[PDB]
Write an enzyme that holds these catalytic residues in place. Structure first.
Site, PDB file in Angstrom:
ATOM      1  N   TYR A  44      -0.841  15.360   4.785  1.00 50.61           N
ATOM      2  CA  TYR A  44      -0.779  13.939   4.478  1.00 50.61           C
ATOM      3  C   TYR A  44      -1.945  13.136   5.081  1.00 50.61           C
ATOM      4  CZ  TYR A  44       3.475  14.193   1.804  1.00 50.61           C
ATOM      5  OH  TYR A  44       4.370  14.463   0.805  1.00 50.61           O
ATOM      6  N   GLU A  58      10.887  15.693   2.156  1.00 53.95           N
ATOM      7  CA  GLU A  58      10.497  17.082   1.919  1.00 53.95           C
ATOM      8  C   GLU A  58      10.936  18.005   3.057  1.00 53.95           C
ATOM      9  OE1 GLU A  58       6.339  16.329   1.132  1.00 53.95           O
ATOM     10  OE2 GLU A  58       6.964  15.152  -0.615  1.00 53.95           O
TER      11      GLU A  58
HETATM   12  C1  HEM Z   1       2.242   9.343  -0.113  1.00 55.85           C
HETATM   13  C2  HEM Z   1       1.558  10.422  -0.501  1.00 55.85           C
HETATM   14  C3  HEM Z   1       1.660  11.046  -1.915  1.00 55.85           C
HETATM   15  C4  HEM Z   1       2.094  10.533  -3.092  1.00 55.85           C
HETATM   16  C5  HEM Z   1       2.598   9.106  -3.383  1.00 55.85           C
HETATM   17  C6  HEM Z   1       1.993  11.573  -4.100  1.00 55.85           C
HETATM   18  C7  HEM Z   1       2.309  11.458  -5.448  1.00 55.85           C
HETATM   19  C8  HEM Z   1       2.305  12.474  -6.390  1.00 55.85           C
HETATM   20  C9  HEM Z   1       2.641  12.362  -7.803  1.00 55.85           C
HETATM   21  C10 HEM Z   1       3.093  11.065  -8.519  1.00 55.85           C
HETATM   22  C11 HEM Z   1       2.503  13.564  -8.360  1.00 55.85           C
HETATM   23  C12 HEM Z   1       2.775  13.959  -9.832  1.00 55.85           C
HETATM   24  C13 HEM Z   1       4.265  14.269  -9.908  1.00 55.85           C
HETATM   25  C14 HEM Z   1       4.742  14.556 -11.310  1.00 55.85           C
HETATM   26  O1  HEM Z   1       4.680  13.645 -12.176  1.00 55.85           O
HETATM   27  O2  HEM Z   1       5.212  15.695 -11.554  1.00 55.85           O
HETATM   28  C15 HEM Z   1       2.069  14.487  -7.328  1.00 55.85           C
HETATM   29  C16 HEM Z   1       1.834  15.833  -7.502  1.00 55.85           C
HETATM   30  C17 HEM Z   1       1.224  16.668  -6.595  1.00 55.85           C
HETATM   31  N1  HEM Z   1       0.855  16.350  -5.285  1.00 55.85           N
HETATM   32 FE1  HEM Z   1       1.378  14.587  -4.333  1.00 55.85          FE
HETATM   33  N2  HEM Z   1       1.515  12.713  -3.481  1.00 55.85           N
HETATM   34  C18 HEM Z   1       1.291  12.423  -2.153  1.00 55.85           C
HETATM   35  C19 HEM Z   1       0.809  13.291  -1.200  1.00 55.85           C
HETATM   36  C20 HEM Z   1       0.363  14.578  -1.427  1.00 55.85           C
HETATM   37  C21 HEM Z   1      -0.174  15.479  -0.426  1.00 55.85           C
HETATM   38  C22 HEM Z   1      -0.339  15.114   1.056  1.00 55.85           C
HETATM   39  C23 HEM Z   1      -0.508  16.630  -1.024  1.00 55.85           C
HETATM   40  C24 HEM Z   1      -1.113  17.874  -0.327  1.00 55.85           C
HETATM   41  C25 HEM Z   1      -1.941  18.709  -0.966  1.00 55.85           C
HETATM   42  C26 HEM Z   1      -0.157  16.499  -2.421  1.00 55.85           C
HETATM   43  C27 HEM Z   1      -0.277  17.470  -3.377  1.00 55.85           C
HETATM   44  C28 HEM Z   1       0.247  17.432  -4.648  1.00 55.85           C
HETATM   45  C29 HEM Z   1       0.211  18.541  -5.569  1.00 55.85           C
HETATM   46  C30 HEM Z   1      -0.362  19.947  -5.310  1.00 55.85           C
HETATM   47  C31 HEM Z   1       0.860  18.042  -6.851  1.00 55.85           C
HETATM   48  C32 HEM Z   1       1.070  18.835  -8.155  1.00 55.85           C
HETATM   49  C33 HEM Z   1       2.494  19.358  -8.216  1.00 55.85           C
HETATM   50  C34 HEM Z   1       2.601  20.264  -9.417  1.00 55.85           C
HETATM   51  O3  HEM Z   1       1.689  20.227 -10.285  1.00 55.85           O
HETATM   52  O4  HEM Z   1       3.596  21.021  -9.512  1.00 55.85           O
HETATM   53  N3  HEM Z   1       0.368  15.246  -2.632  1.00 55.85           N
HETATM   54  N4  HEM Z   1       1.958  13.785  -6.148  1.00 55.85           N
END
Ligand code: HEM
Ligand code: HEM
Lengths: 144, 144
Positions: A93, A135
């Site tokens: 994060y 989480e």
């Molecule tokens: C407050 C912090 C964060 C927010 C608001 C956020 C938000 C999101 C959103 C909206 C999606 C798309 C979800 C969907 O429509 O299926 C997503 C996917 C993803 N995020 Fe986060 N995220 C955050 C932090 C992080 C962090 C720290 C990581 C670390 C690498 C991360 C890695 C990913 C990954 C790898 C996906 C793809 C999941 C998939 O394709 O199965 N995110 N995130």
């Protein structure tokens, strides 16, 4: 929790960031993948790396609701499931925070004072803390 | 959100209230059922009225976690389901707050300054707002 001037900056500035959303999103991902190669595998599909285009904009939406974060829980819960599936860790994060703040600085340009950037750093932390906790409980739930 | 002195009072005083938990709980329910007959049906079983003995103590536990309320979400979610099942409304929360604060005043006696009572009122509001929002989404979820 956050102090009032912090919240004022957030509420006052988040519409500015939203207006320049495409620059925030694209600068964010460009810098995330370039400066932190170790996270690229989590975005690997299967064939280019996936860029969940709503990631940064969803931080901004949370920030809009900074005084009532429970309101975004249905969205957080769904995203949390994808995070836990993908292998997102609490230690990721700060990296996302760093590149988000870099993107914000780029968009705000002159208006990017230290106090406003500090405010966004604090706000991101509080938002990040919600996901981290949700989480953490999902991870623990998995080995019951 | 809450200011720092508020949080200090809460963190400083909640162990005092916990130590006198049995007086908090029993004064709370005595006054709730006596002064607000309209809520008695929600506690009616089936044969005396039920008194979920952990209600007030759970507010206190939330208050302990006032700086990380996401941590209590697994408990909140389970309680929220029972609330929505029972017919708990957002407009009930001020009534429970009033009688909780009356119980707190009784226990604190001399130490029951206006600032400390005001702090607990503010803290209860923030805790109540979490349940209200979670139950609001559960109610909406029910007619999908
Ligand atoms: C407050 C912090 C964060 C927010 C608001 C956020 C938000 C999101 C959103 C909206 C999606 C798309 C979800 C969907 O429509 O299926 C997503 C996917 C993803 N995020 Fe986060 N995220 C955050 C932090 C992080 C962090 C720290 C990581 C670390 C690498 C991360 C890695 C990913 C990954 C790898 C996906 C793809 C999941 C998939 O394709 O199965 N995110 N995130
Ligand atoms: C922050 C405020 C509140 C907290 C922390 C709280 C906490 C709790 C807890 C721990 C239980 C027992 C759950 C279980 O173990 O099954 C409970 C049950 C119950 N509460 Fe709440 N409560 C709150 C507000 C309210 C309000 C405003 C009402 C309005 C009348 C209410 C009415 C009830 C009722 C009727 C039950 C019994 C549910 C059943 O027996 O099926 N509570 N509450």
């Amino acid at each position: 929790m956050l102090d009032q001037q912090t919240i004022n900056i957030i509420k006052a500035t988040v519409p500015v960031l939203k207006e320049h959303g495409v620059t925030i999103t694209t600068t964010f991902y460009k810098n995330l993948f370039a400066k932190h190669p170790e996270v690229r595998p989590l975005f690997d599909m299967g064939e280019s790396l996936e860029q969940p285009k709503a990631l940064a904009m969803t931080v901004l939406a949370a920030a809009q609701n900074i005084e009532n974060l429970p309101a975004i829980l249905p969205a957080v819960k769904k995203i949390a499931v994808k995070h836990c599936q993908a292998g997102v860790a609490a230690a990721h994060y700060p990296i996302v925070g760093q590149e988000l703040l870099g993107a914000i600085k780029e968009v705000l340009g002159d208006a990017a004072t230290d106090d406003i950037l500090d405010a966004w750093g604090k706000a991101y932390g509080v938002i990040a803390d919600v996901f981290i906790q949700v989480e953490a409980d999902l991870y623990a739930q998995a080995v019951e």
